[PDB]
Amino acid sequence: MELYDVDEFWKFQMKVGLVKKAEKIKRTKKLIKLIVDFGNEERTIVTGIADQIPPEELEGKKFIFVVNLKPKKFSGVESQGMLILAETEDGKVYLIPVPEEVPVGARVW
């Protein structure tokens, strides 16, 4: 069922990012706004896992983020990337933190 080429995967850019701050977006039940430090730059990233993962479980940690996607506004918030996580078929979401040793900005691929 559809097999792709590695170079095609390689065009997407995932990097390690440190969550400087994370807070629920007003008037939403699942949205969380993140301010992520990728070393050379900072980015605002929205994730909608607040019904399963509270904001304080992301702050201070490093995670994988796709950073070369088309910008998108959620509830008026400009999201400049996307938090990568694990999710089972039953809809349960799990964070995938990056080890503390990995420098922010490292490429994930």
JSON list of N, CA and C in Angstrom, two decimals, residues 77-106:
[
{"chain": "A", "resi": 77, "resn": "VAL", "atom": "N", "xyz": [-4.62, 31.76, 16.18]},
{"chain": "A", "resi": 77, "resn": "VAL", "atom": "CA", "xyz": [-3.22, 31.62, 16.55]},
{"chain": "A", "resi": 77, "resn": "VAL", "atom": "C", "xyz": [-2.39, 31.04, 15.41]},
{"chain": "A", "resi": 78, "resn": "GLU", "atom": "N", "xyz": [-1.33, 31.76, 15.05]},
{"chain": "A", "resi": 78, "resn": "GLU", "atom": "CA", "xyz": [-0.45, 31.34, 13.97]},
{"chain": "A", "resi": 78, "resn": "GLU", "atom": "C", "xyz": [0.49, 30.23, 14.45]},
{"chain": "A", "resi": 79, "resn": "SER", "atom": "N", "xyz": [0.31, 29.04, 13.89]},
{"chain": "A", "resi": 79, "resn": "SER", "atom": "CA", "xyz": [1.15, 27.90, 14.23]},
{"chain": "A", "resi": 79, "resn": "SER", "atom": "C", "xyz": [2.24, 27.76, 13.16]},
{"chain": "A", "resi": 80, "resn": "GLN", "atom": "N", "xyz": [3.50, 27.83, 13.58]},
{"chain": "A", "resi": 80, "resn": "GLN", "atom": "CA", "xyz": [4.63, 27.73, 12.64]},
{"chain": "A", "resi": 80, "resn": "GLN", "atom": "C", "xyz": [5.34, 26.37, 12.69]},
{"chain": "A", "resi": 81, "resn": "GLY", "atom": "N", "xyz": [4.59, 25.31, 12.96]},
{"chain": "A", "resi": 81, "resn": "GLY", "atom": "CA", "xyz": [5.19, 23.99, 13.03]},
{"chain": "A", "resi": 81, "resn": "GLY", "atom": "C", "xyz": [4.22, 22.99, 13.62]},
{"chain": "A", "resi": 82, "resn": "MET", "atom": "N", "xyz": [4.72, 21.82, 13.99]},
{"chain": "A", "resi": 82, "resn": "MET", "atom": "CA", "xyz": [3.84, 20.82, 14.55]},
{"chain": "A", "resi": 82, "resn": "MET", "atom": "C", "xyz": [4.55, 19.81, 15.44]},
{"chain": "A", "resi": 83, "resn": "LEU", "atom": "N", "xyz": [4.03, 19.64, 16.65]},
{"chain": "A", "resi": 83, "resn": "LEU", "atom": "CA", "xyz": [4.57, 18.71, 17.63]},
{"chain": "A", "resi": 83, "resn": "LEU", "atom": "C", "xyz": [4.32, 17.26, 17.22]},
{"chain": "A", "resi": 84, "resn": "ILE", "atom": "N", "xyz": [5.38, 16.46, 17.15]},
{"chain": "A", "resi": 84, "resn": "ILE", "atom": "CA", "xyz": [5.26, 15.04, 16.81]},
{"chain": "A", "resi": 84, "resn": "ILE", "atom": "C", "xyz": [5.06, 14.20, 18.09]},
{"chain": "A", "resi": 85, "resn": "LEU", "atom": "N", "xyz": [4.10, 13.29, 18.05]},
{"chain": "A", "resi": 85, "resn": "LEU", "atom": "CA", "xyz": [3.82, 12.41, 19.18]},
{"chain": "A", "resi": 85, "resn": "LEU", "atom": "C", "xyz": [3.35, 11.05, 18.71]},
{"chain": "A", "resi": 86, "resn": "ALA", "atom": "N", "xyz": [3.17, 10.13, 19.66]},
{"chain": "A", "resi": 86, "resn": "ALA", "atom": "CA", "xyz": [2.69, 8.78, 19.35]},
{"chain": "A", "resi": 86, "resn": "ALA", "atom": "C", "xyz": [1.20, 8.76, 19.64]},
{"chain": "A", "resi": 87, "resn": "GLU", "atom": "N", "xyz": [0.45, 7.96, 18.89]},
{"chain": "A", "resi": 87, "resn": "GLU", "atom": "CA", "xyz": [-0.98, 7.86, 19.10]},
{"chain": "A", "resi": 87, "resn": "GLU", "atom": "C", "xyz": [-1.47, 6.49, 18.69]},
{"chain": "A", "resi": 88, "resn": "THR", "atom": "N", "xyz": [-2.11, 5.78, 19.61]},
{"chain": "A", "resi": 88, "resn": "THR", "atom": "CA", "xyz": [-2.63, 4.46, 19.29]},
{"chain": "A", "resi": 88, "resn": "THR", "atom": "C", "xyz": [-3.99, 4.59, 18.62]},
{"chain": "A", "resi": 89, "resn": "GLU", "atom": "N", "xyz": [-4.38, 3.52, 17.95]},
{"chain": "A", "resi": 89, "resn": "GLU", "atom": "CA", "xyz": [-5.63, 3.43, 17.21]},
{"chain": "A", "resi": 89, "resn": "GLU", "atom": "C", "xyz": [-6.85, 3.82, 18.03]},
{"chain": "A", "resi": 90, "resn": "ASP", "atom": "N", "xyz": [-6.77, 3.65, 19.35]},
{"chain": "A", "resi": 90, "resn": "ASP", "atom": "CA", "xyz": [-7.88, 3.99, 20.23]},
{"chain": "A", "resi": 90, "resn": "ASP", "atom": "C", "xyz": [-7.92, 5.49, 20.53]},
{"chain": "A", "resi": 91, "resn": "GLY", "atom": "N", "xyz": [-7.05, 6.27, 19.88]},
{"chain": "A", "resi": 91, "resn": "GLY", "atom": "CA", "xyz": [-7.03, 7.71, 20.11]},
{"chain": "A", "resi": 91, "resn": "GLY", "atom": "C", "xyz": [-6.17, 8.20, 21.27]},
{"chain": "A", "resi": 92, "resn": "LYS", "atom": "N", "xyz": [-5.57, 7.29, 22.03]},
{"chain": "A", "resi": 92, "resn": "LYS", "atom": "CA", "xyz": [-4.74, 7.72, 23.14]},
{"chain": "A", "resi": 92, "resn": "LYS", "atom": "C", "xyz": [-3.42, 8.32, 22.63]},
{"chain": "A", "resi": 93, "resn": "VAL", "atom": "N", "xyz": [-3.09, 9.51, 23.10]},
{"chain": "A", "resi": 93, "resn": "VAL", "atom": "CA", "xyz": [-1.87, 10.21, 22.71]},
{"chain": "A", "resi": 93, "resn": "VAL", "atom": "C", "xyz": [-0.77, 10.09, 23.77]},
{"chain": "A", "resi": 94, "resn": "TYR", "atom": "N", "xyz": [0.48, 9.99, 23.34]},
{"chain": "A", "resi": 94, "resn": "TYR", "atom": "CA", "xyz": [1.63, 9.88, 24.25]},
{"chain": "A", "resi": 94, "resn": "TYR", "atom": "C", "xyz": [2.76, 10.82, 23.82]},
{"chain": "A", "resi": 95, "resn": "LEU", "atom": "N", "xyz": [3.35, 11.54, 24.76]},
{"chain": "A", "resi": 95, "resn": "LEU", "atom": "CA", "xyz": [4.46, 12.41, 24.38]},
{"chain": "A", "resi": 95, "resn": "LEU", "atom": "C", "xyz": [5.68, 11.56, 24.08]},
{"chain": "A", "resi": 96, "resn": "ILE", "atom": "N", "xyz": [6.54, 12.08, 23.21]},
{"chain": "A", "resi": 96, "resn": "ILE", "atom": "CA", "xyz": [7.79, 11.42, 22.87]},
{"chain": "A", "resi": 96, "resn": "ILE", "atom": "C", "xyz": [8.86, 12.47, 23.15]},
{"chain": "A", "resi": 97, "resn": "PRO", "atom": "N", "xyz": [9.33, 12.54, 24.40]},
{"chain": "A", "resi": 97, "resn": "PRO", "atom": "CA", "xyz": [10.36, 13.55, 24.66]},
{"chain": "A", "resi": 97, "resn": "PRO", "atom": "C", "xyz": [11.70, 13.13, 24.05]},
{"chain": "A", "resi": 98, "resn": "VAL", "atom": "N", "xyz": [12.52, 14.12, 23.70]},
{"chain": "A", "resi": 98, "resn": "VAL", "atom": "CA", "xyz": [13.85, 13.89, 23.15]},
{"chain": "A", "resi": 98, "resn": "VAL", "atom": "C", "xyz": [14.79, 13.89, 24.38]},
{"chain": "A", "resi": 99, "resn": "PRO", "atom": "N", "xyz": [15.84, 13.03, 24.41]},
{"chain": "A", "resi": 99, "resn": "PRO", "atom": "CA", "xyz": [16.73, 13.05, 25.59]},
{"chain": "A", "resi": 99, "resn": "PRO", "atom": "C", "xyz": [17.26, 14.47, 25.86]},
{"chain": "A", "resi": 100, "resn": "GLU", "atom": "N", "xyz": [17.50, 14.79, 27.12]},
{"chain": "A", "resi": 100, "resn": "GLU", "atom": "CA", "xyz": [17.96, 16.14, 27.48]},
{"chain": "A", "resi": 100, "resn": "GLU", "atom": "C", "xyz": [19.29, 16.52, 26.82]},
{"chain": "A", "resi": 101, "resn": "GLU", "atom": "N", "xyz": [20.13, 15.52, 26.55]},
{"chain": "A", "resi": 101, "resn": "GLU", "atom": "CA", "xyz": [21.43, 15.73, 25.92]},
{"chain": "A", "resi": 101, "resn": "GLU", "atom": "C", "xyz": [21.38, 16.30, 24.50]},
{"chain": "A", "resi": 102, "resn": "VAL", "atom": "N", "xyz": [20.35, 15.97, 23.73]},
{"chain": "A", "resi": 102, "resn": "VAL", "atom": "CA", "xyz": [20.28, 16.45, 22.35]},
{"chain": "A", "resi": 102, "resn": "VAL", "atom": "C", "xyz": [20.14, 17.96, 22.22]},
{"chain": "A", "resi": 103, "resn": "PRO", "atom": "N", "xyz": [21.11, 18.62, 21.57]},
{"chain": "A", "resi": 103, "resn": "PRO", "atom": "CA", "xyz": [21.03, 20.07, 21.40]},
{"chain": "A", "resi": 103, "resn": "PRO", "atom": "C", "xyz": [19.79, 20.52, 20.60]},
{"chain": "A", "resi": 104, "resn": "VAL", "atom": "N", "xyz": [19.16, 21.62, 21.01]},
{"chain": "A", "resi": 104, "resn": "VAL", "atom": "CA", "xyz": [18.01, 22.14, 20.31]},
{"chain": "A", "resi": 104, "resn": "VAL", "atom": "C", "xyz": [18.47, 22.46, 18.88]},
{"chain": "A", "resi": 105, "resn": "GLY", "atom": "N", "xyz": [17.60, 22.26, 17.90]},
{"chain": "A", "resi": 105, "resn": "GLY", "atom": "CA", "xyz": [17.99, 22.53, 16.53]},
{"chain": "A", "resi": 105, "resn": "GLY", "atom": "C", "xyz": [18.51, 21.29, 15.81]},
{"chain": "A", "resi": 106, "resn": "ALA", "atom": "N", "xyz": [18.86, 20.23, 16.54]},
{"chain": "A", "resi": 106, "resn": "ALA", "atom": "CA", "xyz": [19.34, 19.00, 15.90]},
{"chain": "A", "resi": 106, "resn": "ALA", "atom": "C", "xyz": [18.29, 18.51, 14.91]}
]
